[PDB]
Amino acid sequence: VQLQESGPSLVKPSQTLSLTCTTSGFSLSDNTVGWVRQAPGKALQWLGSITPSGSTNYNPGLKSRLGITKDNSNSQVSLSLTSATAADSATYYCTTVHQQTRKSCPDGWMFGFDCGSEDCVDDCSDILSAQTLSPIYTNAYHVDAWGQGLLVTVSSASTKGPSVFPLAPSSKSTSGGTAALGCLVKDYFPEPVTVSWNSGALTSGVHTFPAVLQSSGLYSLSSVVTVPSSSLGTQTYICNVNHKPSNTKVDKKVEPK
Amino acid sequence: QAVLNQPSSVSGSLGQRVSITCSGSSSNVGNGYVSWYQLIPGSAPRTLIYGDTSRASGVPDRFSGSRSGNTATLTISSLQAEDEADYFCASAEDSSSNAVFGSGTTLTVLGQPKAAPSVTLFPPSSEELQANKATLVCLISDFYPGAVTVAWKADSSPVKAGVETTTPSKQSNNKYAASSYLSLTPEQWKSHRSYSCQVTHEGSTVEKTVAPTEC
């Protein structure tokens, strides 16, 4: 199954954050879809879900700001939150929720089958003059599938694409048979950026570091890869930076010195 | 928006057993039907347990859930290095379709082989210099435990301004990596004769040096 979130990575304060989840592999009319978020370094927070019948449930502390919509034909769920503040900067996940209705009788009461069957009775020895009631159905929920999530930043500062500079290997950056090389992704906003190497064909020995917020207010990070030193004249190495907040993709050839 | 209570962090050695508790009242955990989720950085959350004790698809047998009234427990037996993650419990309050998540627990897997770090110091590229900027990039990788201190030098004199350092984080091979930056102007860069990145790790200090009069 697949759940893909989409929307703006940057929302100005007091504006309305809006995200859309495109679904495939379960039909939006059978299973129910919910939204979960998590602020950086905080715990998961339930935002709400929409039932197959179109009914919506919201978190009690955020219902005045939330709103979920459905479109079964296009298979798209929508989430909205008004008066977006800096506390709303988080990663927003699109999920599928699964329910499970359990029937039960009130306390002390018993079923007719355990002794007319579906009803709960007050006395099984009589099963006639005893008081009769209906069973109580209560359902529980668990999240089954999670989307990759979308990092949303609530800020007044403006988007800025990244500058990509090469971290080239030299006669001092080597370590015998292996050499380290990378590219520096400088001055971008907001988060995040994604780096690969040779269009994903180079995954062995790759690491991308967490970003850092500079004094200028922009983010920067690095991505490094270790390759055989004997290949620095035969194999070309390209780092593929991706910045969805600005719809920018940069391919930078790393040349040995 | 009640927050179920979990310990902020637990620990355990390789191959040993670890338990994570999830405290609640009689109206959300006391009802039962508690689920557990695993969050590894760089990955989407992974549903481990649902309905107190049932495993999800593709969940190994070392992951097991249980409940005892108002406190449910997730137990991970034969501990592995890939089990280092954040774990969250959850339950619906009075079956109102709204669910509450736990405070979260960070798991640490100890007993892993110690490793000394390798350090690489890149001088500012020609492209960055042509843009009237200069950033020294000090990359540290393949070390355990993930505790290092980074110092910058200019002609052996300490430098504390214009330095940014990331907190150590896990690599793909369960070892740690960190990065440090020294943002200078091209005039500051061409000024001194050398700049150094000093990395201290377990009674050892590796120093890498770059000179503007080089490659």
Residue numbers in the entry:
A (entry chain H): 2 to 82, 82A, 82B, 82C, 83 to 113, 119 to 259, 262
B (entry chain L): 1 to 9, 11 to 27, 27A, 27B, 28 to 95, 95A, 95B, 96 to 106, ...
Sentences from the study reporting this entry:
The cow antibody repertoire contains a unique subset (~10%) of antibodies possessing ultralong CDRH3s, which can reach lengths between 50 to 70 amino acids. The unique CDRH3 structure can be separated into two microdomains where the antigen-binding disulfide-bound “knob” sits on top of a long b-ribbon “stalk” and can bind to both surface and receded epitopes. Ultimately, we isolated a total of 8 and 11 cross-clade nAbs from cow-485 and cow-488, respectively, all of which had ultralong CDRH3s, suggesting only ultralong antibodies were responsible for cross-clade neutralization detected in sera. BnAbs from cow-485 were named Bess, while bnAbs from cow-488 were named ElsE and assigned numbers based on their order of discovery.
The ElsE Fabs all have CDRH3s with 54 amino acids and 4 cysteines, with a 1–3, 2–4 connectivity, Bess7 has a 61-amino acid CDRH3 with 8 cysteines (1–6, 2–5, 3–7, 4–8 connectivity), while the 55-amino acid CDRH3 knob region for Bess 4 (6 Cys, 1–3, 2–5, 4–6 connectivity) has no ordered electron density in the crystal structure. Ultralong bovine CDRH3 knob regions fold with 3 short β-strands connected by 2 loops (Loop1, Loop2) of varying lengths that can adopt a multitude of different secondary structures, including loops, helices and β-turns. The ElsE series of Fabs all have highly similar knob structures as expected from their high sequence similarity. Flexibility in the stalk is evident in a comparison of the ElsE family of structures that have similar CDRH3 knob sequences and structures, but very different orientations of knob domains with respect to the body of the Fab. The ability of the knobs to twist and rotate with respect to the body of the Fab likely enhances the ability of bovine Fabs to access recessed epitopes. There is no convincing electron density to indicate tyrosine sulfation modifications in any of the antibody CDRH3 regions; however, BLI experiments indicate that Bess7, with 3 tyrosines in CDRH3, contains one or more sulfated tyrosines. Low sulfate occupancy or flexibility in the CDRH3 knob region may explain the lack of electron density for these groups. The ElsE lineage was the most potent and broad overall.
